[PDB]
Design a binder for these strands. Sequence first.
DNA 1: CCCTTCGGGAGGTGCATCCCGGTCTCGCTTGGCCTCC
Length: 263
Amino acid sequence: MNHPVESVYSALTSILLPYMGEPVPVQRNCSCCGRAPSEFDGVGFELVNAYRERVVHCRPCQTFFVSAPELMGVENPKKPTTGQKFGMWSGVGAVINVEDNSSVLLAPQGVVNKLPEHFFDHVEVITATSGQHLEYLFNTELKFPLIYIQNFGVKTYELVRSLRVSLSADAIYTCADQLLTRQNEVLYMLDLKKAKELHQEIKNYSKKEMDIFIRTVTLLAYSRITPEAASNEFKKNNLIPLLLLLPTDPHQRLSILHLLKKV
DNA sequence: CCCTTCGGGAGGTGCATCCCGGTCTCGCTTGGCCTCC
Ligand SMILES: [Zn+2]
Protein backbone atom coordinates (compact mmCIF):
# COMPACT_ATOMS: atom_id res chain seq x y z
CA MET A 1 0.00 0.00 0.00
CA ASN A 2 2.33 2.74 1.27
CA HIS A 3 5.13 2.11 -1.23
CA PRO A 4 6.46 4.30 -4.07
CA VAL A 5 4.99 2.26 -6.91
CA GLU A 6 1.47 2.35 -5.46
CA SER A 7 1.29 6.15 -5.55
CA VAL A 8 2.45 6.44 -9.15
CA TYR A 9 0.06 3.64 -10.12
CA SER A 10 -2.93 5.35 -8.53
CA ALA A 11 -2.07 8.80 -9.86
CA LEU A 12 -0.82 7.96 -13.36
CA THR A 13 -1.20 4.33 -14.46
CA SER A 14 -4.76 3.86 -13.20
CA ILE A 15 -5.88 5.07 -16.64
CA LEU A 16 -5.44 1.53 -17.97
CA LEU A 17 -7.54 -0.03 -15.19
CA PRO A 18 -9.80 -1.73 -17.81
CA TYR A 19 -6.86 -3.37 -19.60
CA MET A 20 -5.31 -5.81 -17.09
CA GLY A 21 -8.09 -8.14 -15.98
CA GLU A 22 -8.53 -9.70 -12.60
CA PRO A 23 -5.50 -10.57 -10.41
CA VAL A 24 -4.44 -14.08 -9.37
CA PRO A 25 -3.69 -15.33 -5.82
CA VAL A 26 0.08 -15.61 -5.44
CA GLN A 27 2.48 -16.95 -2.82
CA ARG A 28 5.76 -15.24 -3.79
CA ASN A 29 7.01 -11.67 -3.60
CA CYS A 30 6.58 -9.41 -6.62
CA SER A 31 9.78 -9.86 -8.60
CA CYS A 32 9.40 -6.39 -10.12
CA CYS A 33 9.27 -4.19 -7.00
CA GLY A 34 10.47 -6.90 -4.60
CA ARG A 35 8.32 -6.13 -1.57
CA ALA A 36 6.60 -8.89 0.37
CA PRO A 37 3.21 -10.40 -0.59
CA SER A 38 1.80 -9.33 2.79
CA GLU A 39 1.08 -5.87 1.32
CA PHE A 40 -0.53 -7.28 -1.86
CA ASP A 41 -3.48 -8.77 0.07
CA GLY A 42 -2.39 -12.13 -1.38
CA VAL A 43 -3.22 -11.24 -5.01
CA GLY A 44 -0.92 -10.69 -7.96
CA PHE A 45 -0.59 -10.89 -11.73
CA GLU A 46 1.45 -13.74 -13.14
CA LEU A 47 3.39 -12.97 -16.31
CA VAL A 48 6.10 -14.25 -18.63
CA ASN A 49 8.50 -11.67 -20.03
CA ALA A 50 10.39 -11.57 -23.32
CA TYR A 51 13.14 -13.66 -21.67
CA ARG A 52 10.77 -16.53 -20.71
CA GLU A 53 10.83 -15.93 -16.95
CA ARG A 54 7.83 -16.47 -14.68
CA VAL A 55 7.46 -13.14 -12.85
CA VAL A 56 4.75 -11.98 -10.45
CA HIS A 57 3.78 -8.31 -10.72
CA CYS A 58 1.48 -6.74 -8.17
CA ARG A 59 -1.43 -4.47 -9.10
CA PRO A 60 0.61 -1.23 -9.32
CA CYS A 61 3.59 -3.00 -10.93
CA GLN A 62 1.76 -4.99 -13.61
CA THR A 63 0.51 -1.73 -15.15
CA PHE A 64 4.00 -1.11 -16.55
CA PHE A 65 3.59 -4.16 -18.84
CA VAL A 66 -0.02 -3.72 -20.02
CA SER A 67 -0.77 -3.33 -23.73
CA ALA A 68 -3.61 -0.82 -24.25
CA PRO A 69 -3.29 0.43 -27.85
CA GLU A 70 -6.85 1.81 -27.79
CA LEU A 71 -5.75 4.07 -24.90
CA MET A 72 -1.96 4.37 -25.27
CA GLY A 73 -1.75 4.37 -29.07
CA VAL A 74 0.64 2.25 -31.12
CA GLU A 75 4.30 2.36 -30.11
CA ASN A 76 5.82 0.55 -33.12
CA PRO A 77 3.79 0.27 -36.37
CA LYS A 78 5.54 -3.02 -37.18
CA LYS A 79 3.55 -4.54 -34.27
CA PRO A 80 0.16 -2.77 -34.27
CA THR A 81 -1.40 -4.97 -31.58
CA THR A 82 0.98 -3.87 -28.78
CA GLY A 83 0.60 -0.23 -27.79
CA GLN A 84 2.78 1.97 -25.64
CA LYS A 85 3.67 0.45 -22.27
CA PHE A 86 4.50 2.48 -19.17
CA GLY A 87 7.48 0.22 -18.53
CA MET A 88 8.85 0.55 -22.08
CA TRP A 89 8.78 4.34 -22.56
CA SER A 90 12.28 5.75 -23.09
CA GLY A 91 12.74 9.50 -22.84
CA VAL A 92 9.32 9.95 -21.18
CA GLY A 93 9.00 11.12 -17.59
CA ALA A 94 6.28 12.18 -15.20
CA VAL A 95 5.64 14.10 -12.00
CA ILE A 96 3.14 12.53 -9.60
CA ASN A 97 1.62 14.49 -6.72
CA VAL A 98 0.94 11.77 -4.16
CA GLU A 99 -1.19 13.78 -1.72
CA ASP A 100 -3.32 15.06 -4.60
CA ASN A 101 -2.82 11.69 -6.35
CA SER A 102 -2.52 13.49 -9.70
CA SER A 103 0.03 13.07 -12.48
CA VAL A 104 1.52 15.19 -15.25
CA LEU A 105 3.30 13.36 -18.07
CA LEU A 106 6.46 14.84 -19.63
CA ALA A 107 6.63 13.14 -23.02
CA PRO A 108 8.44 14.30 -26.18
CA GLN A 109 6.51 15.44 -29.22
CA GLY A 110 6.82 12.05 -30.93
CA VAL A 111 5.17 10.19 -28.06
CA VAL A 112 2.48 12.88 -27.81
CA ASN A 113 1.78 12.36 -31.51
CA LYS A 114 1.55 8.61 -30.96
CA LEU A 115 -0.86 9.06 -28.06
CA PRO A 116 -4.59 9.16 -28.98
CA GLU A 117 -6.99 11.88 -27.92
CA HIS A 118 -8.57 9.66 -25.26
CA PHE A 119 -5.26 9.47 -23.38
CA PHE A 120 -5.11 13.19 -22.61
CA ASP A 121 -8.56 13.13 -20.99
CA HIS A 122 -7.28 11.03 -18.07
CA VAL A 123 -3.68 12.31 -17.84
CA GLU A 124 -2.50 15.83 -18.60
CA VAL A 125 0.48 15.70 -20.96
CA ILE A 126 2.91 18.53 -21.71
CA THR A 127 5.28 18.16 -24.64
CA ALA A 128 8.84 18.10 -23.29
CA THR A 129 11.94 16.24 -24.44
CA SER A 130 14.40 14.52 -22.10
CA GLY A 131 16.31 17.78 -21.60
CA GLN A 132 13.14 19.83 -21.05
CA HIS A 133 12.02 17.93 -17.94
CA LEU A 134 14.23 20.20 -15.85
CA GLU A 135 12.68 23.27 -17.49
CA TYR A 136 9.20 22.18 -16.41
CA LEU A 137 10.39 21.30 -12.90
CA PHE A 138 12.16 24.64 -12.45
CA ASN A 139 9.51 26.90 -13.95
CA THR A 140 6.36 25.21 -12.63
CA GLU A 141 5.37 25.29 -8.96
CA LEU A 142 5.90 21.72 -7.80
CA LYS A 143 3.75 20.25 -5.02
CA PHE A 144 5.41 17.93 -2.51
CA PRO A 145 5.52 15.06 -1.64
CA LEU A 146 5.93 13.96 -5.26
CA ILE A 147 7.40 11.13 -7.32
CA TYR A 148 9.47 12.49 -10.22
CA ILE A 149 10.25 9.84 -12.83
CA GLN A 150 12.78 11.16 -15.33
CA ASN A 151 13.09 8.19 -17.71
CA PHE A 152 10.51 5.41 -17.68
CA GLY A 153 13.03 3.56 -19.82
CA VAL A 154 12.79 -0.16 -20.44
CA LYS A 155 14.28 -1.57 -17.20
CA THR A 156 10.99 -1.59 -15.34
CA TYR A 157 12.38 -3.52 -12.37
CA GLU A 158 15.14 -0.99 -11.77
CA LEU A 159 12.64 1.82 -12.33
CA VAL A 160 10.29 0.59 -9.62
CA ARG A 161 13.19 -0.13 -7.28
CA SER A 162 14.45 3.43 -7.89
CA LEU A 163 11.18 5.23 -7.11
CA ARG A 164 11.51 7.54 -4.10
CA VAL A 165 9.11 10.17 -2.78
CA SER A 166 10.49 13.71 -3.03
CA LEU A 167 9.32 15.21 0.25
CA SER A 168 10.40 18.78 -0.60
CA ALA A 169 12.26 20.87 -3.16
CA ASP A 170 15.56 20.51 -1.28
CA ALA A 171 15.84 16.93 -2.56
CA ILE A 172 13.93 15.78 -5.65
CA TYR A 173 14.74 12.14 -6.45
CA THR A 174 14.87 11.46 -10.19
CA CYS A 175 13.81 7.95 -11.22
CA ALA A 176 15.67 7.33 -14.48
CA ASP A 177 15.10 3.52 -14.74
CA GLN A 178 18.64 2.97 -13.36
CA LEU A 179 18.73 1.12 -10.04
CA LEU A 180 18.93 3.80 -7.34
CA THR A 181 21.66 2.35 -5.16
CA ARG A 182 22.94 4.37 -2.23
CA GLN A 183 26.08 4.96 -4.33
CA ASN A 184 24.38 6.68 -7.27
CA GLU A 185 21.53 8.73 -5.83
CA VAL A 186 23.83 11.76 -6.11
CA LEU A 187 23.41 11.42 -9.89
CA TYR A 188 19.62 11.12 -9.43
CA MET A 189 19.12 13.68 -6.62
CA LEU A 190 18.13 17.19 -7.76
CA ASP A 191 18.08 20.12 -5.31
CA LEU A 192 15.53 22.44 -6.92
CA LYS A 193 15.84 24.84 -3.97
CA LYS A 194 19.59 25.37 -4.36
CA ALA A 195 19.31 25.58 -8.14
CA LYS A 196 16.48 28.09 -7.74
CA GLU A 197 18.42 30.36 -5.39
CA LEU A 198 21.50 30.12 -7.61
CA HIS A 199 19.37 31.05 -10.62
CA GLN A 200 17.87 33.97 -8.71
CA GLU A 201 21.30 35.31 -7.76
CA ILE A 202 22.89 34.62 -11.18
CA LYS A 203 20.94 37.53 -12.67
CA ASN A 204 23.45 39.90 -11.05
CA TYR A 205 26.26 38.50 -13.26
CA SER A 206 26.95 39.21 -16.92
CA LYS A 207 26.35 36.61 -19.61
CA LYS A 208 30.10 36.50 -20.22
CA GLU A 209 30.67 36.10 -16.48
CA MET A 210 27.98 33.41 -16.50
CA ASP A 211 29.59 31.40 -19.30
CA ILE A 212 32.95 31.81 -17.54
CA PHE A 213 31.57 30.55 -14.22
CA ILE A 214 29.82 27.56 -15.79
CA ARG A 215 32.84 26.51 -17.84
CA THR A 216 35.24 26.95 -14.91
CA VAL A 217 33.08 24.92 -12.54
CA THR A 218 32.51 22.22 -15.16
CA LEU A 219 36.23 21.89 -15.86
CA LEU A 220 37.00 21.83 -12.14
CA ALA A 221 34.37 19.16 -11.48
CA TYR A 222 35.99 17.19 -14.32
CA SER A 223 39.51 17.97 -13.04
CA ARG A 224 40.48 19.61 -16.34
CA ILE A 225 41.70 22.83 -14.69
CA THR A 226 43.72 23.08 -11.50
CA PRO A 227 41.91 24.45 -8.42
CA GLU A 228 44.28 27.43 -8.39
CA ALA A 229 43.26 28.29 -11.95
CA ALA A 230 39.56 28.04 -11.11
CA SER A 231 40.07 30.16 -7.99
CA ASN A 232 41.90 32.78 -10.06
CA GLU A 233 39.05 32.80 -12.58
CA PHE A 234 36.43 33.21 -9.85
CA LYS A 235 38.36 35.98 -8.08
CA LYS A 236 39.06 37.88 -11.30
CA ASN A 237 35.39 37.58 -12.34
CA ASN A 238 34.02 38.17 -8.81
CA LEU A 239 32.29 34.77 -8.83
CA ILE A 240 32.94 34.02 -5.14
CA PRO A 241 29.29 34.05 -3.94
CA LEU A 242 28.29 31.67 -6.72
CA LEU A 243 30.90 29.16 -5.59
CA LEU A 244 29.81 29.69 -1.98
CA LEU A 245 26.30 28.66 -3.08
CA LEU A 246 27.53 25.56 -4.94
CA PRO A 247 27.61 22.16 -3.22
CA THR A 248 31.05 20.78 -2.46
CA ASP A 249 30.13 17.60 -4.33
CA PRO A 250 31.37 17.83 -7.95
CA HIS A 251 28.63 15.56 -9.30
CA GLN A 252 25.93 17.69 -7.71
CA ARG A 253 27.70 20.73 -9.15
CA LEU A 254 27.50 19.16 -12.60
CA SER A 255 23.83 18.24 -12.12
CA ILE A 256 22.79 21.73 -11.02
CA LEU A 257 24.85 23.29 -13.81
CA HIS A 258 23.13 21.02 -16.34
CA LEU A 259 19.85 22.23 -14.86
CA LEU A 260 20.97 25.87 -15.02
CA LYS A 261 21.99 25.79 -18.68
CA LYS A 262 18.57 24.30 -19.51
CA VAL A 263 16.51 27.07 -17.89
C1' DC B 1 126.76 18.49 -16.74
C1' DC B 2 124.15 21.88 -20.13
C1' DC B 3 119.13 23.40 -21.93
C1' DT B 4 113.59 22.76 -24.50
C1' DT B 5 112.42 29.06 -29.43
C1' DC B 6 109.40 32.60 -31.71
C1' DG B 7 103.58 33.07 -34.09
C1' DG B 8 100.53 32.85 -37.87
C1' DG B 9 96.04 32.61 -38.72
C1' DA B 10 91.06 30.00 -37.57
C1' DG B 11 85.72 30.88 -44.42
C1' DG B 12 83.04 32.59 -47.40
C1' DT B 13 77.43 29.90 -49.05
C1' DG B 14 73.26 26.97 -50.22
C1' DC B 15 68.63 25.42 -48.98
C1' DA B 16 65.26 23.15 -45.13
C1' DT B 17 58.95 19.23 -49.67
C1' DC B 18 54.74 17.55 -51.24
C1' DC B 19 49.77 14.12 -48.65
C1' DC B 20 46.88 10.81 -47.11
C1' DG B 21 43.15 9.82 -43.80
C1' DG B 22 40.91 9.42 -38.32
C1' DT B 23 35.73 2.82 -38.04
C1' DC B 24 32.10 -0.14 -36.70
C1' DT B 25 29.39 -0.87 -30.57
C1' DC B 26 27.00 -1.35 -26.87
C1' DG B 27 25.50 -2.43 -22.88
C1' DC B 28 16.97 -3.07 -23.10
C1' DT B 29 12.47 -5.12 -23.79
C1' DT B 30 9.20 -6.68 -26.59
C1' DG B 31 6.74 -9.04 -30.55
C1' DG B 32 6.89 -10.75 -35.48
C1' DC B 33 8.72 -14.25 -37.97
C1' DC B 34 11.42 -18.84 -38.56
C1' DT B 35 12.14 -22.99 -38.20
C1' DC B 36 12.53 -26.87 -34.23
C1' DC B 37 10.57 -30.11 -31.35
ZN1 LIG C 1 5.38 -4.97 -7.55
